[PDB]
Symmetry: C13
Subunit: 69 residues, 13 copies
């Protein structure tokens, strides 16, 4: 039950984080394609946004380990 | 049952928080691409919107922990 | 059952709240990118809309805590 | 089964009400962007539509409370 | 089972009624935005349409109460 | 089992009836917006199509009552 | 088991019939809007098409009652 | 199990057949609006396609009745 | 288990078959509408494709009957 | 367990196969509509693609029978 | 359990393999239609891509068999 | 439980790997069609992306085997 | 439950990572096709984005092995 729990928590967090980053990274690739001169502005948005999007997935991962220990 | 509960809360919280942020960050990246001159305005919307979107997912994380402890 | 229940309520409230805020903030970012003069106008709608969209999710959070305590 | 029932009613009602509101608010933001002279008219539609959309979710919340108490 | 049933009936009715109302209201807002002269005509379609969409969700709320009591 | 059954039939009937009506009403709001001279004509199709779409959801509500009583 | 079965059969039949009708009535409303002189023509296609789409859902409703009785 | 099986078979057959016919009728309505001259030609394709689409659902309904009786 | 099995095989076969045919017929209708002079040619693709698409659903139907009997 | 297994393998194989073929056939019909001179070319792509798309669904059918027998 | 296991690996691998191939082949057909001069190069892409898409679906099929045997 | 596990690992790995490869191969085909001068550029992108996308599904396949042995 | 747990974590991790990488690689390909000069800029974004998006999926894989061993 602890195993199932930890797995569901880890599993959903993986999906959460991976898709979220992918959406953001795509956005900056498309924007950069549209406006090469905004490369740096766009990249900084990516670097701010990724951590924000991974925050709760990371927490859920931690909880996943707490369930396992 | 406590493990499963906590996993579900954290897992769904992860999905909610991560995707929400991505939608918002993407919108911001796109907007800034269309209108570089609006950078700051759009970044303010991001910084306001992100916390607002995280609020309930964060509360569900607190509940996930209350279930575990 | 109480743990499982508390989780289902909080988890679903997280999704509901996070996604609804994303949709509203994204529309606000988009409206503003399109018509920068309506920046304040669109901001006011975001500030009215968000509490409205969070209302039921927040009540579900309370019910979650009630199920738990 | 009461906890599970309460949660299910409350969580679904939260998804229902939050997303319904997001859709209505997003329409209002899009409409006001295109036709700013109509902001009042549209805001009235939003203030009518929102309560209408929240009606069954709230009754489900009330049912969630009856299941608990 | 009475609790689980009542909650399933009420949860689904809320999803049904709220989303359906949102869709209709959105349409009315988009329509009124394109053709402001039609605002009353469109509003009458909303007021006729909303009760029709809510009809069966309301019946299912009654059934939810009949199962609960 | 009766309770669970009645709720599944009522809840699915609600989703069915509410969404279909919404689809049909949206379409008549959009059409009326594009071709206001067709107001009456389109309203007639709405009034024909709504009962038709509600037919089977209503039989299922009846079956829902038969399971409860 | 009979109750569950009757509910599943009737609930799936309601979704089926209601959505199918909705798709056809919508197509009819859109078509009529684009070509008002084909009102009768298209209305005939609706009246042929609806019974065809409703056919199996109605059989499933018969099976629902056979299961209930 | 027989009841639940007959129900799954008939309910899936209803979803399959109603949606399938709706897709085909819609195409026929859209085609006729686009190129009204082909009314009869498209109607023939509809009359050929509807029975073909309905074939496996109807067999599944028969299997439903075999499971029941 | 036999009953449940036969119903899953048959119901899934029905959805596969009916929707596959609809997609192909829809395409043939759209094709014919755009290029009336290819009527015969597009029809022949339809008569080749339906049997091909229906091939595995039909086997699934045989397996459903093997399970029953 | 063997009946439920055989039904799952077969019913999934049916959805896999039917839908894959429908997607390929539709693409052939659309291509032939747009470029009638490529008829034979596109038809050969269809005849290579369909067996390939069905290879795994077909193996899943064999495995389904191995489970029954 | 062995049976149910083999069925899930096989049906999943069937869905994965068929749909992937359908997407790749549809791409080849659409591209060949737009730029027939690239028939050979697009066909090489497809003959490289299809096996790569099938790699893990085929391994999963091997596992399904180890589970059975 | 082992069989079931192994099957969930391998079937999800199959879906994951297959669809991902299809998305990438499709993108390669569509781009080469728009810009045949870049067929080698695009193909190098494809040969880099594919192994990356398969990394985790391949590992997950290893795990599936560990579970089974 | 350890087996089932490890499989859920590894399988969800595979879907997460595969799709995220694919979305990103697709974006890179589309951008490179639209703007061949940015080839290297876009490729760097891809080499930053991929490791990022696979981070949490990799942690879930690690967790999958913990659960197993
Ligand atoms: C458990 C299932 C996991 C996978 C669920 C689906 C994964 C894919 C999610 C991403 C889908 C949406 O993409 P996107 O980049 O926002 O497109 C934006 C397109 N524009 C450029 C026009 C804005
Ligand atoms: C349980 C697993 C759940 C997986 C959830 C995955 C959901 C991903 C949804 C992301 C897609 C939405 O993207 P977005 O930025 O709103 O743009 C959409 C509108 N435009 C393209 C025009 C901008
Ligand atoms: C476990 C289940 C998780 C569910 C996750 C579902 C994610 C849904 C995300 C929805 C994102 C899209 O929103 P939106 O901007 O209103 O549409 C865009 C419309 N425009 C084309 C006008 C821009
Ligand atoms: C279990 C949790 C489920 C969460 C599901 C969330 C889904 C939210 C999707 C809502 C999408 C709302 O976009 P829409 O009204 O089509 O925009 C159309 C705007 N234009 C008319 C300008 C194009
Ligand atoms: C259990 C979770 C349930 C969540 C379900 C969410 C469903 C939301 C679907 C409704 C999305 C919008 O649709 P609509 O406004 O009719 O069309 C869009 C209008 N245009 C055609 C002009 C773009
Ligand atoms: C239990 C959860 C059930 C949720 C079910 C929600 C279903 C909502 C989808 C129905 C709204 C769709 O609107 P529509 O008029 O077809 O526009 C679609 C956009 N076009 C007109 C361009 C096609
Ligand atoms: C549990 C069941 C939940 C209910 C599921 C709801 C499904 C709703 C799907 C209904 C979608 C409406 O399609 P349609 O109007 O034929 O397309 C119109 C396309 N054009 C307007 C661009 C031509
Ligand atoms: C349990 C779920 C039951 C409800 C499922 C609803 C499925 C709706 C399927 C789609 C219904 C209508 O789209 P369609 O006729 O394919 O044309 C769309 C493409 N065109 C715009 C070119 C015409
Ligand atoms: C009951 C549970 C299972 C229900 C499954 C129902 C699924 C029905 C979905 C049928 C949709 C098929 O649309 P179509 O004609 O290929 O057009 C698609 C054209 N575009 C891709 C360009 C939009
Ligand atoms: C039990 C589960 C059953 C699920 C059944 C779902 C079936 C839905 C399949 C729908 C596939 C539709 O794709 P398509 O028409 O090839 O794309 C058309 C795109 N263009 C027109 C732009 C080329
Ligand atoms: C449980 C089993 C359910 C299986 C249901 C699988 C349904 C898969 C349907 C997937 C069809 C996707 O088509 P596609 O190639 O992306 O075309 C998109 C056309 N354009 C790129 C031009 C826009
Ligand atoms: C059991 C679950 C089975 C799920 C099967 C999922 C089907 C695969 C996903 C659907 C196909 C996604 O096509 P894509 O090339 O990414 O976007 C479209 C490319 N354009 C930019 C041209 C629009
Ligand atoms: C077991 C269930 C597994 C389901 C996995 C299904 C995954 C489907 C992934 C398909 C997502 C494709 O999004 P994307 O590449 O951003 O297209 C964006 C194209 N535009 C920019 C034109 C919008
Ligand atoms: Na973008
Ligand atoms: Na945007
Ligand atoms: Na918007
Ligand atoms: Na509208
Ligand atoms: Na319409
Ligand atoms: Na239409
Ligand atoms: Na059509
Ligand atoms: Na077509
Ligand atoms: Na592409
Ligand atoms: Na892109």
């Amino acid at each position: 039950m602890a195993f199932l729990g930890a797995a569901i928590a880890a599993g959903l967090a993986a999906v959460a984080g991976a898709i979220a980053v992918a959406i953001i990274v795509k956005a900056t690739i498309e924007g950069t394609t549209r406006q090469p001169e905004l490369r740096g502005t766009l990249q900084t948005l990516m670097f701010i946004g990724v951590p924000l999007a991974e925050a709760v997935p990371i927490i859920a991962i931690v909880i996943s380990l707490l369930i396992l220990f």
